[PDB]
Amino acid sequence: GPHMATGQDRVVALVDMDCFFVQVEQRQNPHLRNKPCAVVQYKSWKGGGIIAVSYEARAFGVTRSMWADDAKKLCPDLLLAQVRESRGKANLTKYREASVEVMEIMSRFAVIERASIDEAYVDLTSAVQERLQKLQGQPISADLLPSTYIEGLPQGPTVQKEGMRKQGLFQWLDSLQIDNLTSPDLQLTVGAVIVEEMRAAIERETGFQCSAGISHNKVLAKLACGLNKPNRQTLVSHGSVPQLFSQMPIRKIRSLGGKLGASVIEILGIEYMGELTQFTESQLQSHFGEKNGSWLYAMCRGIEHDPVKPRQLPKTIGCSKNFPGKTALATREQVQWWLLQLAQELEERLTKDRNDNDRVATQLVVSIRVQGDKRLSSLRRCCALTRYDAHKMSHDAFTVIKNCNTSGIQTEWSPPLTMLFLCATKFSAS
DNA sequence: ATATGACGCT
DNA sequence: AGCGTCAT
Ligand SMILES: Nc1ccn([C@H]2C[C@H](O)[C@@H](COP(=O)(O)NP(=O)(O)OP(=O)(O)O)O2)c(=O)n1
Ligand SMILES: [Mg+2]
Ligand SMILES: [Mg+2]
Numbered sequence: 001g002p003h004m005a006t007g008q009d010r011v012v013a014l015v016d017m018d019c020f021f022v023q024v025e026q027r028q029n030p031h032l033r034n035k036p037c038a039v040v041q042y043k044s045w046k047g048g049g050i051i052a053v054s055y056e057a058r059a060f061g062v063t064r065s066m067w068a069d070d071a072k073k074l075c076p077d078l079l080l081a082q083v084r085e086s087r088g089k090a091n092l093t094k095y096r097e098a099s100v101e102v103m104e105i106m107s108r109f110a111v112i113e114r115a116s117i118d119e120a121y122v123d124l125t126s127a128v129q130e131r132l133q134k135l136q137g138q139p140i141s142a143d144l145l146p147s148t149y150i151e152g153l154p155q156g157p158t159v160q161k162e163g164m165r166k167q168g169l170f171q172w173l174d175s176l177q178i179d180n181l182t183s184p185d186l187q188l189t190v191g192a193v194i195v196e197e198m199r200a201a202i203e204r205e206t207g208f209q210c211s212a213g214i215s216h217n218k219v220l221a222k223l224a225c226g227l228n229k230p231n232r233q234t235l236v237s238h239g240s241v242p243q244l245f246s247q248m249p250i251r252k253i254r255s256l257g258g259k260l261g262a263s264v265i266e267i268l269g270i271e272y273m274g275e276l277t278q279f280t281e282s283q284l285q286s287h288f289g290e291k292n293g294s295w296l297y298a299m300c301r302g303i304e305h306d307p308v309k310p311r312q313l314p315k316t317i318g319c320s321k322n323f324p325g326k327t328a329l330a331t332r333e334q335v336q337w338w339l340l341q342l343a344q345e346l347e348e349r350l351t352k353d354r355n356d357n358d359r360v361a362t363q364l365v366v367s368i369r370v371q372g373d374k375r376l377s378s379l380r381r382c383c384a385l386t387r388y389d390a391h392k393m394s395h396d397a398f399t400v401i402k403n404c405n406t407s408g409i410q411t412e413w414s415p416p417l418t419m420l421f422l423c424a425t426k427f428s429a430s
Numbered sequence: 431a432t433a434t435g436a437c438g439c440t
Numbered sequence: 441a442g443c444g445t446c447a448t
Contacts, residue, residue, distance in 0.1 A: 020448095041432090045431060049431085049432045051432080051433085066432085083433095090433065115436090115448085116434095116435075116448045117435090117448070119448075257446070258445065258446055258447085259446090291438090314434095314435065314436090316435065318434055318435070319433085320434065321433080322431085322432085322433080325431050375444080376444085377443075380442055381441095382441075382442090421433090423434090
C-alpha cells in the first residue's frame with residue numbers, strides 16, 4: 001500500500017567502455033580504427049588467445065577466448081594487436097593507465113565505484129538533486145539526450161533503429177511530470193542527462209566511447225547498460241521492470257550467472273526473472289538462505305540496496321600466470337625463477353602505487369594450482385610483506401609454498417604447477 | 431591450452 | 441586463516 005518502499009531512492013549508473021582493450025590499441029594505431037580487430041596475448045599457441053573484439057569483428061562471429069588462428073577462419077581480414085609482454089608474461093599496464101584516464105574524468109561528476117578495469121558504478125543521486133534546482137522546472141529537451149534509449153518505449157498506437165529511439169524518447173519526455181522534483185522518473189531522466197555529459201567528456205578527452213545504464217540500483221544499471229551497446233545509453237525505469245523481467249533469463253542478472261542462478265532455475269522450475277515474484281520471501285530463504293532469499297525477493301521486483309562504494313582504487317595488487325598442459329612447472333628452479341618474474345612486476349606496480357596513492361601493502365598472498373585440479377586456486381598461503389623487494393618477496397613466497405612439493409628428489413617439483421599467483425593486500429595509509 | 435579482482439562462508 | 445563463488 002502506502003508503506004511499500006519501491007527501490008526508487010537513488011539514481012545509479014554503470015558505465016562500461018566498448019571493447020576497451022581494442023579501443024586503447026586503436027587510439028594508438030590509427031590503421032586499426034573502424035576495422036574488424038582483436039587484442040591477442042601470446043602469439044605462439046594457435047596465434048594467441050583473443051581477449052577483446054571490436055564490434056566489426058563481432059559481426060563475423062569472432063569472440064573472446066577464441067584462438068586467433070580460428071578467428072581468422074571466420075574473419076580473414078581480422079587485424080590483431082598484441083598485449084605487451086614483460087618478463088615472459090602478459091603485461092596489462094597500458095590498459096590500467098587508460099583505465100585511470102577514464103575513472104578520473106568520471107570522478108569529476110560524482111562518486112565512483114571502480115567495478116573492473118573498464119567499468120564503474122556512479123551514484124548520481126546528489127548531482128541529480130543539485131541539477132534539479134539549477135534547472136528550475138525547465139522541461140528537458142530531447143536534444144539533451146541524443147544517445148539515450150528508454151527501455152520499453154515506444155509503445156502502442158518506424159523501421160530504422162534511430163527512429164525507434166527517438167519515438168520512445170519523445171513518448172517518455174511528453175509523459176514527464178517536471179513540476180514534481182521528487183518524481184523518480186524525472187530524477188532518472190536528469191541522471192541520464194548528466195551521463196550524456198560524462199560520456200561526452202570521456203570521448204572528448206580520451207577518444208574512448210562507452211555505453212551506460214541509468215536506473216535506481218546497481219543491478220538494473222548494469223543490465224540497462226548492455227541493452228543497447230555500443231556507444232549508447234539506456235534508462236530502465238522502475239515501471240519498465242515487470243515487462244523487462246517477464247522474458248529476462250535468470251542468468252542475465254548480476255550474481256545469478258553461476259551456480260546460484262542455476263539452482264534457482266532447477267529448484268523452482270522457472271526460466272525468467274519475473275517468475276520469482278510468485279514466491280514468498282520465506283520460501284526463497286528456505287531454498288537459498290536468509291541473505292539470498294531476501295535479495296531475490298526484492299530484486300525480482302526491481303529493488304536492490306547494495307551501495308555504490310566510494311572506491312576508485314583496487315584493494316589488492318596481483319600478478320599471475322598459468323602454465324597449462326606440457327608447460328606445467330616440474331622443477332624447483334622453474335618455480336623459483338617464475339616467482340621472481342612475478343615478484344619483479346609486482347614490485348614495480350607496488351612502488352608506483354605507493355607514490356601515486358600514499359599507501360603500502362602489508363600482506364603477501366601466494367596462490368598455486370596443481371596439475372589436474374580444475375579449481376582456480378589449489379592452495380593459498382600468506383606472509384608479511386615488509387619490503388617492496390622482488391627477491392625477498394619471491395623467496396618468502398617460495399618459503400610458504402615449498403612444503404607442497406611431494407617430490408622425493410630435490411631437483412623436482414610434483415605435482416606440476418599450472419598456476420603461480422602473487423597478490424599484495426591489506427593496505428595502510430603511508 | 432583462455433590475468434586479474436571483489437567478496438562470502440567457515 | 442584458507443577455501444569457494446562470481447565476475448571482467
Ligand atoms: N574474461 C575477460 C573479460 C574482459 N577482459 C578485459 C578485455 C576487455 O576489453 C576488458 C573489458 O571487459 P568487458 O567489458 O567484459 N568487454 P569489452 O570492454 O571488450 O567489450 P564490451 O562488450 O564491454 O563492449 O577486460 C579480460 O581480460 N578477460
Ligand atoms: Mg566493456
Ligand atoms: Mg566491463
